[PDB]
Design a binder for this molecule. Structure first.
Ligand code: 3PH
Ligand code: 3PH
Ligand code: 3PH
Ligand code: LDA
Lengths: 223, 102, 51, 90, 74, 88, 76, 94, 150, 68, 60, 67, 90, 51, 50
């Protein structure tokens, strides 16, 4: 209810919701990390993707809720009615700053700036140069620039984590082969012995608790 | 304690003193939560336990519509003798003609 | 002040520090109003303070 | 003017009695009682009451509600079977 | 108990609405000092008509909605 | 009684709907019935016809389950159907 | 216990205080002596006044039913 | 009332605090919506059963609004709920 | 007729049912152990994934179906009365305790407590946690806090 | 009805009664004028009821279809 | 509610003396205007809420 | 404190001086939150705890119709 | 005629990104819609305008134009969102 | 026993003493479940087995 | 169309009673054919698209 166009906007947003969650939210990172852990342990079907994605979605909800609540309360407020296009548009813009400021901590400055340079109207000569002050440039780059830079930087940071997770298992896999060769049993496949060792190591390390905690700690602050 | 309920009631035909007497004869009155208002007027406030409040408000509102058939406006007849003039419309006869005055 | 005081939400964000003497509140209140940028009123029952 | 009253302090709901009728989708017993009555009747009272506006306004409720109940069960069974197939493939 | 009391009271109430309690009575009152009928006098050059008590009272009350009270000189 | 045929058709479809819950899982397991073979518009039309061919009670009298919570019931029937699918 | 088209009829029936009986009375008197011009002159007035009373009442209730039926039609 | 205006001194809002759980935040919504709808339906029904309401243009004009507002409210709650579960389903089947 | 919101809640629940089963029920354990043992025997595709998932599903129902049926028997109860949104919320929450207890039994207290903090503490200006004495919060961890910890 | 099973008067009665009285003397203006407004109010009531029942059923049908 | 009040005043004055042509002439006008007003209001209310329902049906 | 309420009221038949007296006889009168206005006219301003403000606004506005 | 005023100079802004072009098109439509709805509501309740054939002939058009405009904006928005959804699903 | 049923009934033409006699001649009367009311009046209470 | 123009046919009560039947039958015939063809193609859509 209210302005007919505000209603249209609400319904459009709620229609695009899953693509936003899939492309501009920490869900991107958690989804990748859990699957990489499964591959590092060497399991092809355990757990199901339907279990891993469920966990990842729940964990993401905690991180994202406070922003959605703050933006909702900000718009469910009768304070004002607006005289003009410039007043309304700047009131709208000031509501998204919480999200804009979430994206800014994690996207990378140089890629963000390159995308902002990309949007400007073309010129016949190369574009007229500019430098702009921080309250736009640092504080307020446009969201249609921030969003893909975020997605890309997140993917990268995810691969990085997966790399570290692989290292100890690689160590195991080598050592076990070298010991079997020292015993001369050259023909036996070492996978049959290395796999359970890997599982033992992961449960004694309690890898799930550590991963689930530290991933949240990267975004929340808890005391 | 937090369950206290409060209401304001405004009768038309039944004065507060009329309702207090009903409560007393009924044996429903409670001196810890008496009705507060003007015994002469018909508007009062009540606060207390739910059952008490609900009973009070219901009884009052039924009393009000019951007494509504009472008719109170009445007409009277006054008799007045004239001492100095004829009451009726007055005819004189001129030599050949009647003529008449209001 | 011998009155209840109501502070607007936007005013409640501001912070203050130091050691203060409430010897004459109305005179202290108006001075701080001018220094901090507040506006205030008094209906006879409560004092209201806004940014 | 007459009989006026208002409850000032609290929003105690009074237009309805709040009741377990909040917590169900269909009053299946009320359906099963109405469906009984319009089906036990076989050569008693009379047929063809297409025409009296007071009973014809009671039939409208039943004819609608039983169509909705039957439509709902059709979806629930598909959902259930689909959930089983979803788990067994995955 | 409550449900029986409530329904019994309401139906006993409704079974009485058709009963009428008002009534009409007739008073016969002789006039000790005057003729009841309207009087008329015929004179050599004049005719005069004087209304009676019944005529005057009827002409006064005709169409009245309110009850009467306090005549002065369930 | 005028509406009796209308109600008698609705009793039929309510019975068929509750039978589908128990017949369809069998069609999922068997190698000549699964959707690798029988798919599209025929599939439901055939399953429903079979369920009506085997329902045990006269189709024209009111279904007995109108008084019961639907979900526990549907899950019960689907579990039974899965067990039969395995044994066959 | 009654609706609002009865409130609208009753505004006429309480508006013309007594006419409903006055007509019957006038007829009772005229029936006794049809050849009296004072009675005839009185009855003409009462009967005409009554005829208009009834017409205005019925046309007003018709109009209010036409307004209501049109609002109800939009509940769809 | 009509001869009175009644404000709020300053609208502080304790319920702006997020402090409750993501599920208590759900139960509030469900409980409040269920009560609001049952009350509205009952009111609409009474406005039709009562003969002085269903026959006065002034009252009919109001009832028309009540009916439309009810319709829109329920239709929007349904729509948003579907969109919500549909998002979960889209992600988890991916 | 019924209530139009309880109808929405019924239809919604029945769409989420397979994801709840797949993520908050012993099916999670049963379906894993079998497939592991199958790999250890060194001959995949004997038994079929169809056999294994089918059995795991059936066994999970013995554990979980009584709890759901108990909850519906709790709600179909004609003697209750309510007065306010709070009094209704409490009674609906009370209905879920049968499930809550199962999740509490099979999951870690400290990971549950961690998520219970994490839902809020981004709000909080403070470090003290004692501020509610345990007896309420220890009983009432939220279900969204319990699920991933389980 | 004379019956209650333990566990005012409506327009439907008032119309039947005014029709019954009228039919005894179809040419009396007081009775005719008393009947016009009862038949009108009954027509309005009996339309408004059915139209709103129809609205509530179309709402529930749309919900079920939306979750199909 | 001014045009709602005016018509009920006119009706009382008329009901007082149903045969006075000046009163009849006034009432005819007042009743006709009220009659047009109600219809116009109801029809526009309908249009405004059919547009909302068509929006929701578009995304639903 | 942050819950204080207030209202402004206009009476078409009952003067302020007529109403204060009623409050006194009732024993509802409260010198910490007196009404503020012209005893001669019928318009005033009031503020206070919410149950008090609501009680006052309702009593005055009903009694204005009784008289 | 009497008591009438017009704003001569609009305030102005830079437009540098697709973000600002979008917020600007949104804000431009919202206000025009609110203004139109209010105008119509007033024209339905000034009694000099409800009852004059010349003024009713205008109100008819205003209502029509409102209906058409809001239906267009709804349709084209839903088409755009559907094209995004289709490509990402594919 | 928990299938017992109750009703209240209100006659307009006939009266309780008129109706008892009918039950008697019918041989339907049952001293365990008699009608309870005022024989002169036409309103009574009845409770018993469904039939 | 030709019956509607012959001034003898368009103004005689006998002939008008015929024209009214002729136009009612034409209307029902075309509505029937246009409905059954739509059902017919709807069957093909149901089988092939599905
Ligand atoms: C990724 C999101 C892109 C979605 C594409 C939206 C397409 C808008 C359709 C169009 O161009 O006509 C607008 C059309 C332009 O009309 P104009 O003012 O006459 O130029 O209508 C409007 O005025 C703007 C209304 C747009 C409302 C969409 C809000 C979407 C919010 C996204 C979630 C936050
Ligand atoms: C799980 C995800 C649920 C999606 C929630 C969609 C929110 C819809 C909305 O905003 O309208 C709120 C709507 C209006 O509240 P308002 O926004 O405060 O006005 O309230 C509701 O009706 C919500 C009803 C929720 C029922 C969801 C079914 C959950 C079943 C799971 C049971 C598990 C045991
Ligand atoms: C989220 C908000 C909660 C809403 C709850 C309100 C429900 C209501 O009051 O109306 C009942 C209403 C159903 O109507 P009814 O069938 O006529 O009683 O809504 C429902 O659909 C019931 C959903 C609540 C029951 C939760 C049971 C969870 C058991 C967990 C088992 C998990 C594994 C499944 C095993 C296979
Ligand atoms: C197989 C799932 C569908 C049917 C529901 C079965 C519920 C569990 C009943 C277990 C009874 C076990 N027992 C007799 C030892 O109590």
């Amino acid at each position: 209810m209210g302005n007919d166009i505000s209603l249209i906007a609400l319904l459009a947003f709620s229609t695009l919701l899953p693509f936003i969650i899939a492309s501009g939210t920490c869900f991107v990172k958690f989804s990748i990390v859990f699957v990489m852990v499964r591959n590092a342990l060497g399991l092809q079907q355990i757990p199901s993707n339907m279990t891993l994605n469920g966990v990842a979605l729940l964990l993401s909800m905690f991180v994202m809720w406070p922003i959605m609540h703050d933006a909702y309360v900000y718009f469910e407020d009768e304070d004002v009615t607006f005289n003009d296009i410039s007043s309304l548009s700047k009131h709208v813009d000031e509501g998204l700053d919480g999200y804009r400021d979430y994206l800014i901590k994690y996207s990378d400055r140089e890629l963000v700036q390159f995308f902002e340079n990309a949007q400007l109207k073309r010129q016949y000569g190369e574009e007229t140069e500019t430098v702009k002050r921080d309250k736009d440039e640092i504080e307020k780059p446009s969201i249609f620039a921030l969003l893909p830079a975020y997605a890309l930087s997140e993917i990268k940071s995810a691969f990085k984590i997966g790399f570290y997770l692989y290292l100890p298992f690689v160590v195991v896999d080598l050592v076990v082969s070298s010991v079997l060769l020292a015993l001369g049993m050259m023909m036996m496949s070492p996978v049959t012995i290395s796999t359970p060792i890997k599982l033992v190591l992961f449960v004694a390390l309690d890898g799930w608790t550590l991963l689930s905690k530290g991933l949240i700690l990267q975004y929340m602050d808890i005391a | 304690a937090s369950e206290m309920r409060n209401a304001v009631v405004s009768l038309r035909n039944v004065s507060l003193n009329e309702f207090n007497n009903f409560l007393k004869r009924s044996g429903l009155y409670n001196k810890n939560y008496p009705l507060r208002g003007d015994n002469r007027k018909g508007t009062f406030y009540v606060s207390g336990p739910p059952v008490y409040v609900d009973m009070v408000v219901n009884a009052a509102t039924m009393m009000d519509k019951q007494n509504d058939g009472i008719e109170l406006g009445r007409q009277k007849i006054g008799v007045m003798r004239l001492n100095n003039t004829f009451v009726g419309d007055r005819t004189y006869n001129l030599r050949d003609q009647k003529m008449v005055i209001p | 002040l011998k009155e209840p005081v109501i502070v607007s939400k936007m005013a409640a964000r501001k912070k203050i520090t130091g050691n203060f003497e409430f010897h004459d509140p109305n005179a202290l209140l108006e001075k701080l109003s001018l220094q901090l940028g507040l506006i205030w009123y008094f209906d006879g029952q409560a004092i209201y303070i806004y940014d | 003017v007459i009989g006026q009253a208002v409850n000032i302090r609290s929003m105690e709901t009074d237009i309805v009695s709040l009741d377990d009728r909040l917590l169900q989708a269909f009053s299946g017993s009320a359906i099963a009682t109405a469906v009984d009555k319009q089906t036990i009747t076989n050569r008693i009272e009379d047929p063809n009451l297409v025409t009296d506006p007071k009973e014809l306004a009671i039939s409208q409720e039943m004819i609608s509600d039983y169509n909705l109940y039957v439509s709902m069960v059709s979806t629930l069974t598909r959902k259930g079977v689909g959930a089983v197939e979803t788990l067994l493939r995955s | 108990y409550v449900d029986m009391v409530v329904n019994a009271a309401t139906m006993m109430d409704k079974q009485n609405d058709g009963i009428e309690l008002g009534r009409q009575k007739i008073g016969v009152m002789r006039l000790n000092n005057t003729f009841v009928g309207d009087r008329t006098y015929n004179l050599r050059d004049q005719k005069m008509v004087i209304p009676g008590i019944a005529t005057a009272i009827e002409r006064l009350l005709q169409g009245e909605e309110q009850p009467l009270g306090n005549i002065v000189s369930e | 009684m005028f509406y009796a045929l209308y109600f008698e058709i609705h009793h039929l479809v309510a019975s068929a709907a509750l039978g589908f819950a128990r017949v369809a899982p069998i069609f999922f397991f068997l190698p000549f019935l699964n959707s690798g073979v029988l798919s599209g518009a025929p599939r439901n039309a055939i399953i429903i016809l079979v369920a009506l061919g085997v329902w045990p009670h006269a189709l024209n009298e009111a279904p007995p389950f109108l008084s019961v919570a639907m979900i526990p019931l549907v899950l019960q029937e689907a579990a039974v159907g899965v067990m039969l699918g395995c044994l066959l | 216990w009654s609706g609002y088209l009865d409130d609208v009829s009753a505004k006429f029936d309480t508006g013309v205080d007594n006419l409903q009986t006055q007509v019957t009375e006038a007829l009772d008197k005229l029936a006794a002596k049809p050849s009296d011009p004072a009675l005839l002159a009185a009855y003409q007035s009462k009967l005409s006044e009554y005829n208009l009373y009834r017409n205005a009442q019925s046309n007003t209730v018709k109009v209010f039913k036409d307004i209501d039926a049109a609002i109800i039609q939009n509940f769809r």
